[PDB]
Each structure stands twice: as structure tokens, then as C-alpha cells.
A and B are shown apart, each in its own frame.
With several copies, the nearest count.
Chain A
Amino acid sequence: MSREQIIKDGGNILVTAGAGSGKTTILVSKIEADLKENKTHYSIAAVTFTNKAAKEIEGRLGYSSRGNFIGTNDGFVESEIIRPFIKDAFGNDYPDNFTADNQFASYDKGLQVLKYQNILGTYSNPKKNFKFQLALDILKKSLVARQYIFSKYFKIFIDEYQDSDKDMHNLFMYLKDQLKIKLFIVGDPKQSIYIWRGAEPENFNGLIENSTDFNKYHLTS
């Protein structure tokens, strides 16, 4: 079946797979194949929505001294973009300390909380994201941030793309286009029950029905 046409493909890929298809198995197989094939210094990043899937993938992959990021997409920005390069973009007064109750309805008040209060902000409206817009803002203001992101990873694995806001799409597409980093997207179109958290199913469907540089496969197993 098509499960052998994926491991042999290197680049941008989609996998429109429904429930019970075995997304974890194919994701782990592709990750292991990519790591075994490549002999350079580059790494991979696997971004999920829950800590359970992150821990499952971490346990399945094993142990290595190569630095790969496995975790949630909220931890990705905090660990890679915001915490290291916040002061290089805005200034030395902006703090890199935070432990995240204090949600507001504006971006400027989010910056004010992060600075004066010294705690990561939030938004009251679930249709808009503070983390993934601040991350993209930092990426466009810091040259060393973009340099590190380009020098570090050669592929990023994304799963459950249907439950993604517009800010997540913006950041991922910025990475794909402006920084020339490959993407591996897996998602079920009919699993948008998380719409109560601001999920936008239109992004995955638009990618499926309009993308020209994406290779598309479907799994019925």
C-alpha cells in the first residue's frame, strides 16, 4: 500500500488519515527513517497538542545525543524562539523569566504583563493566539533567531493540523516559505470537535485543495 511511498519521499508531505488509521505508527516510522538516512548535524522537531502523545513518541523513539525536540507546539515556541531571543528583538528590559488567571483582551497588555508582572500573558478570546503571534514577531526582528532556526532543524513533524488557529498556520508557513524548512503534516479533516478552543478547519482543507508544493497521500488502514 501507500505506506511505502511515504518513507521513500523526502520533502513536503500531507497524510489525510482518519481515525483508526495508525498515525502514530507512520509518524514514528518516518521519523526513524529520516534520522537514520541523514548523517549531518541537523535535527527534527515533533509538535503535538497533548503531553501524552509527546511522551508516547519520546518513549518509542528512544535515546540519542542528537538534539531533537519532541513535545507540544506551545512548548516549541517558548523553548526555541521566545525565551532565548525575546531581549534581542525588543530590548534588554523585556524579561525571559516566566512560569506560564492573568488573561486579558489585548496584545499590548500581554506585553505589559510579561514585562511588569514577569509572567506569560494570555487572551480571553480563544480565537486569537498570543504565543504564536509574539513568536512570529520575534522571528521577523531577530536575525540570530532565524539563523538558529535554520541551522538547527531540517524537518518539522506536525500532527492534528485541523485543530490549528490562524497564528499557528502563519508561523508554520513562515518557516516553510521564508526559512525553507520541510514540513510533514498529518490530520483528520472530520475531527474538528475542538472548535471550542478556536480551531480553524479551513486551513487544513485549503492546504489539501490548493497546495502545489505539497505531496498528498491518504491512509485507509
Chain B
Amino acid sequence: MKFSNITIKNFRNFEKVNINLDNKNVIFGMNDIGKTNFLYALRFLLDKEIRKFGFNKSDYHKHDTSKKIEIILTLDLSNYEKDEDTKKLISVVKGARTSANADVFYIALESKYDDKELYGNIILKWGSELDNLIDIPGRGNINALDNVFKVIYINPLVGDGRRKMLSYSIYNYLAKKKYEDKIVIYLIEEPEISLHRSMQIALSKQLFEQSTYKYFFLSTHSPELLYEMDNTRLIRVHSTEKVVCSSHMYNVEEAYGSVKKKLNKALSSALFAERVLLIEGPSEKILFEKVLDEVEPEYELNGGFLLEVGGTYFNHYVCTLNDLGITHIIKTDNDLKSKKGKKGVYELLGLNRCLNLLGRENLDEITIDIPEDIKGKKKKERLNERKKEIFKQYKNEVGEFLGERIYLSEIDLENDLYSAIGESMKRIFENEDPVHYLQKSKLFNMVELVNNLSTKDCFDVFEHEKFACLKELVGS
């Protein structure tokens, strides 16, 4: 019914790795050697044309053939009543199961090297109990496990994208009719080799929204394949010499239903990064791009990313990034949102969004008089004074935030930028109040500002204490 876990020991560059699984799995990362060895281990366990040969001396970890290779896969048999693949497995297995362990099954591989004959023999076992496994029976070249699983291996190597799509179609409508009595698993390795972008999006839709691909493992370098992802395991291989892996069970909540196409596009490109800074809009994008190009031109070559979050909460992105082992930085500002309906009551939106990431959730509302006489700049400064009071009140919570790489502004980014480059802003924005003028047209006035900034101003912004997230992004 469901793949659960896999363990690999003393195989190639794997020494002891434990990875949680699901039916649909995507592996990505920068190693590019462990990613291929993962699929090779799967093929050795489940593919008879690869297991037909043995293990060489180079298949052992550190080429030390005095160690034993173990590969063990785990399944869940909880839905025997509602699934027909559980019956396909159970009809070949008879006796290796016990009633106390009727919901878990194991399939293992073991190899010990023969120094005299220079050969590594592979012997397979299954069982319900991991301390009591028995050999899978078979006659001649055939195995009892070969009667169940059908492993289909896809690789573009060993316009033309239309030929690739035709190949995928023939695969889909051939593996159905011919293999109605088997469990089919697809191994798709880098399907984007010579493929147009729109074809990658089409293949993503096929993978994640069609029933022909119930079980698969996918290796990819392209975020366009992940535009439709949902209900899948994401496995990330850390960019080091020792193979380290992190996995996350990705889902999209029903609440995040109408914006699902934005979350996926935004988060697809951040999965291929090392540090991500979460921002709000394009004004911050413009400002930080200018400053970084001036100070740290190669920040994106070393694994930096700027992510625009928009009008949602940070939970969806932070859960995924944290579970995959990617560093996240957040910069926010104290916002008050007028409640729908009753007038004079506002919601501590910024504090609430920052709290929800600390487990603590939501906070009481506030009321401000705001007499009808005052309006305009006077009301703006009244709200700003209220924001200052709120910021000073919750100083301990702010200190807690700074420990999580969360940076909340007292009022806004405009005031923080003033506190750093006030003289330059007064020069550029001649005959106006810099903050008020900059806040009239967010986009055009920001371009006006960045068009008149020098390297001194960029280094002033970079080295300020109010902009300590930029140092985190570039790794100091």
C-alpha cells in the first residue's frame, strides 16, 4: 500500500543513511553522485536485470570489501481491505507473515565479498519481523519477488521534446494493459535534458495529477517540474562529501487552495538554495538587489535567494525549508490592519505572524480613538506612535524573535532606511519629507532612490544594525 523507509549501509558513498518515503518521491540536491547511487540501490533491490550481476570491489564503501552491504525497504500493509496491491504482495508471500505483525513487511538485501573468487554475491530475504527473515524462494534464474514488482527505468539518454512526450504516452498506456497483475514502479532520472519549459510543466501535471504514476522516484535539476507538486516526499541531499539527507512530507492545506499556484512557483526555486530571505513585496526586492549588487555581487552564486511571501502567513514555507535543512531569514514590520466592519479596532498583524512561527498564536486586539477631525499625516503619525508603544511593550517577544532569525521593524522599512541614509535621502528627495514622499508611489520612487545611490550608501545600509538579515543571507 505504502512505502515507508529505506536503510543503506556500506554501499558506495553511503555509510549509514535512513530515509523516510511515500508513494511519490522527489530527490534533489547538489551532490549528483548520491542522487544516482540512490536509484542504483533501488534498482539493485528491485531490478532483476541489475541484480543479475554481482557487486564489484568499487561497490563497497571506501573500497573496504571486509564490510557487509545492507539495503532494507519497509512497507505498510494497513489497507489490505481497500487496496489490491496488498493482495498482489500477500499472494506470493505465504508463511513469512505473522498475525501480530500483519501490517508491516520487510525486504532486505545482503552481500559479503569473496576474496578468493573476487565476487560479491547478493542474497534476498523478506519477513514481517526484522530479526527473523528468510530467503525468497526461486528456481533457476527467477525469484518469487520478480512475480510482484515491475521496475520501469526512464532516462532521456541511454521538437525532440515531442518525441519525449510520445515516449511518455506509450509508457503510460503500455504499462497499464500489459501489467495489470503487477506493481509498477517508475524511476525517472533528469527528464528535462533537452525539454522545452512548457513541456516540463506538462510533465509535472502528468506526474502529480494522473493515476498512472502511483509509485515513482524522480531526480531533477529543474524547478519547472515542481510547479504542480502535492502529496509527495521531498528528499534533499546535502552538498558535502559525506552523504546526508533530509526528507519532508509535502502537502498543501485546503485553506491555501486558491493561491496554490503561487506558493508552488515561489517555493520551487527556493528548494535549490542554501539560505533564503523571505520578503514582502517588489520594493524590498529592488532595494536589496541594488544593495547586494553593489556590495556582494555573487551572493546568488554561493546559494542565496530572495523569496516574496506576499499576503499569507510564513508557516507553509518555513515548515518545508526547516524540514529540508535550508536556512530561512524573515524580515517583517509592525502592521495594524483595520478590522472588517466595526471602526476603530485594528489587528496586530505583524506580531501575530511572527508569533505563529514560535508556536504561540494570535493576540488580543486594540482600539484607537482617531477622532474624525484628524486625517492624513496626523493620523499616520498617531498610528506610528501607537506602533512604537506596541513595539516597546513586547520587548521580550522581540528578543525571542531575534534568536529565530526573525527581524521585525518598529514601524516600516522606510523608517529603518531613513535611520541609515537620511542625509542621502534628503539630498535625493529635495523639498519633501523623505519617508512620506517615498511612501506615496512605492515602486517609482524606489527606482528614483536606487538610481541615485552610491557605493557609500550601499555600504552604510549593509553595515547597519537594522539590516542584520542581509549579513545572514550572505553568510556574514
Chain A positions near chain B (C-beta within 8 angstroms)? 39-43, 65, 80, 84-85, 88, 142-144, 147-148, 150-152
Are B99 and A41 touching (Cβ within 8 A)?
no
Closest residue of B by beta carbon distance from A66: B181
Question: From residue A196, how far is it (CB to closest CB) to chain B in Å?
Answer: 36
Q: Is B97 an interface residue (CB 8 A)?
A: yes
Please, which residues of chain A bring their CB within 8 A of the CB of B340? none
The residue of chain B having its C-beta at the shortest distance from the C-beta of A38 within the complex is B181
Q: Does B341 contact A (CB under 8 A)?
A: no
Judge whether B99 and A84 touch: CB under 8 Å. Answer: no
- With A39-B180, A39-B181, A41-B181 known to touch, is A88 a contact of B98 (CB < 8 Å)? yes
A76 to chain B, nearest CB (A): 14
Chain B residues, Cβ within 8 Å of A148: 90-91, 93-94, 97
**CA A97 – CA B180 in complex, angstroms?**
37
Residue from the list A39, A42, A65, A88 in contact with B99, Cβ < 8 A: A88
Contact of A147 (CB < 8 Å), options: B102, B147, B182: B102
Nearest chain A residue, comparing its CB with the CB of B142: A65
Knowing A41-B87, A148-B90, the reply to whether A143 touches B95 (Cβ < 8 A) is: no
Which 9 interchain pairs have the tightest Cβ spacing? A84-B95, A151-B87, A41-B181, A151-B91, A151-B90, A144-B97, A152-B91, A143-B99, A148-B94
When chains A and B are docked, how far (Å) is the Cα of A147 from the Cα of B180?
Answer: 21
CB pair B180–A85 under 8 Å, yes or no, is: no
Contacts A/B (CB < 8 Å), 25 sampled: A39-B180, A39-B181, A41-B91, A42-B91, A43-B91, A65-B147, A80-B94, A84-B94, A84-B95, A85-B95, A88-B97, A88-B98, A88-B99, A143-B102, A147-B90, A148-B90, A148-B91, A148-B93, A148-B94, A150-B87, A151-B87, A151-B88, A151-B91, A152-B91, A152-B94
Which residues of B from 161 to 212 have beta carbons under 8 Å from A? 180-182
Q: Is B459 an interface residue (CB 8 A)?
A: no
Q: Which residues of B lie under 8 Å from residue A142 when comparing CB positions?
A: 99
Q: Which of A40, A65, A147, A148 has the most CB of B within 10 A?
A: A147
Q: Out of B86, B102, B181, which one reaches A144, CB within 8 Å?
A: B102
Decide yes or no: A147 and B95 within 8 Å by CB, A39-B180, A40-B180, A40-B181 being known contacts: no
CB closest chain-B residue, reference A43: B91
Q: Residue on B with the closest CB to A96?
A: B95
Interfacial chain B residues near A43, Cβ < 8 Å:
91
Q: How far is the CB of A110 from chain B (nearest CB, A)?
A: 22
- Interface residue? B53 (CB, 8 A): no
Give the nearest-CB partner of B99 in chain A. Answer: A143
B122-149 interface mask toward A, CB cutoff 8 Å, 1 = contact, 0 = none?
0000000000000000000000000100
With both beta carbons as reference points, the residue of chain A lying nearest to B148 in the complex is identified as A41
B80 at the interface (CB under 8 A from A): yes
Residue of B whose beta carbon sits closest to that of A152:
B91
On chain B, the residues within 8 Å of A88 by CB distance are 97-99
What residue of chain B has the Cβ atom nearest to residue A89's Cβ? B99
Contact residues in A for B97 (Cβ distance below 8 Å): 88, 144, 147-148
* Contact yes or no, B180 A144, CB < 8 A: no
Q: Could you list 15 further interchain pairs (A-B, Cβ under 8 angstroms) beyond the known A41-B181, A41-B182, A148-B91?
A: A39-B180, A40-B180, A41-B91, A84-B94, A88-B99, A143-B99, A143-B102, A144-B99, A144-B102, A147-B80, A148-B93, A148-B94, A151-B87, A151-B88, A152-B91
| B76-118 interface (Cβ within 8 A of A) | 80, 86-88, 90-91, 93-95, 97-99, 102
A161 to B180, CA, bound (A): 35
Most buried by A among B99, B147, B182: B99
A11 to B172, CA, bound (A): 33
Residues from 197 to 239 in B contacting A, C-beta threshold 8 Å: none
Of B86, B93, B97, B180, the most chain A CB neighbours within 10 A belong to B97
Residue of A nearest to B87 (CB): A151
Cβ of B86: which chain A residues have Cβ within 8 Å of it? 151
Write out the residue numbers on chain B whose beta carbons fall within 8 Å of the beta carbon of A65. Answer: 147
Closest chain B CB from A119 CB (angstroms): 20
B residues in contact with A42, CB < 8 Å: 91
Q: Which residues on the A side are within 8 Å of B87 (C-beta)?
A: 41, 150-151
Neighbour of B88 across the interface among A39, A41, A85, A143, CB < 8 A: A41
Please determine whether A144 and B91 come into contact, CB atoms closer than 8 angstroms.
no
Q: A39-B180, A40-B180, A40-B181 given as contacts; is B98 within 8 A of A144 (CB)?
A: yes
B137 → A minimal CB distance (Å): 12
A186 to chain B, nearest CB (A): 26
Closest-by-CB residue of A relative to B180 is A39
Find chain A residues with CB under 8 A from B181 CB.
Answer: 39-41
- Once bound together, how far apart are the Cα atoms of A155 and B181, in whole Å? 17
Taking the closest CB of chain B, its distance from the CB of A220, in whole angstroms, is 39
Contacts of B94 in A (CB 8 A): 80, 84, 148, 152
In the assembled complex, which residues on chain A have CB atoms less than 8 Å from the CB atom of B99?
A: 88, 142-144
Alpha-carbon gap, A132 to B253, bound state (A)? 54
**A41 neighbours in B (Cβ, 8 Å):** 87-88, 91, 181-182
Docked pose: A41 CA to B182 CA in angstroms: 8
User: Across the interface, which residues of A come within 8 angstroms of B95, CB to CB?
Assistant: 84-85
Residues of A within 8 A of B88 (CB): 41, 151
Q: How far is the CB of A156 from chain B (nearest CB, A)?
A: 15
What residues on A are CB-neighbors of B102 within 8 Å?
143-144, 147
- Determine the chain A residues whose CB is within 8 A of the CB of B98 once the complex forms: 88, 144
Give min CB distance, B101 to chain A, whole Å. Answer: 9
Chain B residues with CB below 8 A from A144, complex form: 97-99, 102
B contact residues around A80 at 8 Å (CB): 94
Which A residues are CB-close (under 8 A) to B147?
A: 65
B90 / chain A contacts, CB cutoff of 8 Å: 147-148, 151
Distance in angstroms from B126 CB to nearest chain A CB is 14
What CA separation (Å) do A142 and B182 show in the bound complex?
26
**Smallest CB separation, A2 vs chain B (Å):** 32
- Identify the closest chain A residue to B90 (Cβ): A151
Closest to B89 in A: A151
Closest to A150 in B: B87
Which chain B residue has the least Cβ–Cβ distance from A85? B95
Which A residue's beta carbon lies closest to that of B182?
A: A41
Q: How near does chain A come to B336, taking the closest CB pair, in angstroms?
A: 61
Contact digits for B44-88, partner A, Cβ 8 Å, 1 yes 0 no: 000000000000000000000000000000000000100000111
